[PDB]
Structure formats: C-alpha cells, structure tokens
C-alpha cells in the first residue's frame, strides 16, 4: 500500500477540532483522530470508505 498510509495521524498546527479518518496499519483499519483544520497530510480522510479505498 502507499507509504503515507503508514504515517501516524497529523493534527497540524491549527486549533480547530475536526474529526477525520486515518489508516492505522498496526490495527489494519481506519480510525478517527482530531485534525486541527490546516496543513493536512495524506493519511487524512473525510470518511471511512475513502480511507479504506485508498489505504485498504
């Protein structure tokens, strides 16, 4: 699978509380984390479906 799928979730410097999805390779599925609202990395999805499609 793509390399960005193995990177830990990135909250970013902004201070909003936006729930996003990321692929947890260690667990083998997509979970949620808190995204700050800016400078998102690639392991950041708006839904579980897109997360699993891209990093599944």
């Amino acid at each position: 699978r793509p390399d960005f799928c193995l990177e830990p979730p990135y909250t970013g410097p902004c201070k909003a509380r936006i729930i996003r999805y990321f692929y947890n390779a260690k667990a083998g599925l997509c979970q949620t984390f808190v995204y700050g609202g800016c400078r998102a990395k690639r392991n950041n999805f708006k839904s579980a479906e897109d997360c699993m499609r891209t990093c599944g």
């Binding site: 410097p13 902004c14 201070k15 909003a16 509380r17 808190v34 700050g36 609202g37 800016c38």
Partner: protein, 213 residues
C-alpha cells in the same frame, strides 16, 4: 486550554461555540447579528450556540442560531495562516442579556505585556489568564513564520496554552477583543506559545464588511 481553569458560569458572555454536528471551533459575538472567528474554521453550514457553559447539557440559557452568511478575509492564506479571520452573520438577531453579550473591538493595538483572558472548550468553558508577548520573542519561537498580522500570547516556558477546539475563540484584554485563537506547534510546549490573529489590524475591514452586508 492547558493549565487553565474552568470559567465562572456565564462570565464570558461573548463566547460562542460553532457547531456543525459537534463543537469544532469558538467565536466571539461583536454585535447582535455578527460573530467573528478564524478563517480556518470555515464550513458551508454552521450553527452558532450562545449562552453556553456546559456544551453537553441543555442548561436553559442557550440560544441556537444558524449562520446566514460566512465571509472569510479575502487575503486568507491556508498555508501560512496569514489573515486568519472570518465573519459570520446570523440568520436573525440574538437576544442580549447577562448570559449573551457583545465584546468591543479594539480601539488600538495592545502593547506587549498586556494581561488578557483566553477562553474555549478545547464539557465546561475553560479560561486562561496570559499576556501578549513581545513580537521579538514570538518570532524567535517561530523562525520566519510570524507576520505582522499575528501575535503570540502565553508563556515561553509553556504549561498553559489554548489547544484544539479553541480556534476562532477570543483573547480579550482590558475589555477589547485583541486576538483570535489560530495556531501553534503542539499545545503548552516550551518555546512555542500560541499564535493568534491580531484583531487590531482588521477593525476597518470588519466594520466595512458589516456595513455592506
């Protein structure tokens, strides 16, 4: 907010919560029909909740109002976070009382050293007393990342800071809104105090925008 304290119930009447299903940002009421927040808090649909203390319980003093118009500063930069300010016009005027009140816009830019109050839910509203830091120290903490439209507030030793969930929230000094919670590297980390939008550079844009909408 780290190292802060729970605000006295309704002691920050200008504080609002932005909700699009759940609380995601804060904001400040500047008049009975307008709220100011951070541009990175933009969402196509936003419900403003006023008179809140506990965000998870219906207390009886709350007012729920939908956003009618959302206007981000035309020069907002999603990468540098320069000009991170946004105005929200409410669908209808809110009822002003002891629990729901406006905060004044700055008469001028407050000098470094001025003590301020930062608030947010980053589920009870949290408060933090902290000073505006010298621009020189802000720049030293964030090499080449600070513009004239930003100001650091907090402590260089860390321990106390605003955090995720506080964005768009108020930094009030001597009764005037001087800052908007924007960004920072981590929260309450030494040598990385929170960075805030410097509201005093936008008073005219705010007033002109309100007058045209």
């Amino acid at each position: 907010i780290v190292g802060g304290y729970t605000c006295q119930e309704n002691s920050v009447p200008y504080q609002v919560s932005l909700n699009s299903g759940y609380h995601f940002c804060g904001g400040s009421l500047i008049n009975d029909q307008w709220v100011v927040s951070a541009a990175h808090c933009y969402k196509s649909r936003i419900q403003v909740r006023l008179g809140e203390h506990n965000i998870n319980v219906l207390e009886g003093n709350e007012q729920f109002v939908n956003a009618a118009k959302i206007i981000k500063h035309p020069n907002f930069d999603r990468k540098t976070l320069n000009n991170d300010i946004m105005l929200i016009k409410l669908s209808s005027p809110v009822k002003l009382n002891a629990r729901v009140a406006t905060v004044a816009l700055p008469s001028s830019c407050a000098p470094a050293g001025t003590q301020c109050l930062i608030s947010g839910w980053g589920d009870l509203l949290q408060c933090l007393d902290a000073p505006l830091l010298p621009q020189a120290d802000c720049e030293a903490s964030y090499p080449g990342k600070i513009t004239d439209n930003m100001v650091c507030v907090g402590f260089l030793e860390g321990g106390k800071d605003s955090c995720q969930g506080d964005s768009g929230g108020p930094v009030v000094c001597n009764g005037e809104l001087q800052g908007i919670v924007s960004w920072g590297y981590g929260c309450a980390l030494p040598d990385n105090p929170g960075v805030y939008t410097k509201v005093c550079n936008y008073v005219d844009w705010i007033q002109d925008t309100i007058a045209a909408n």
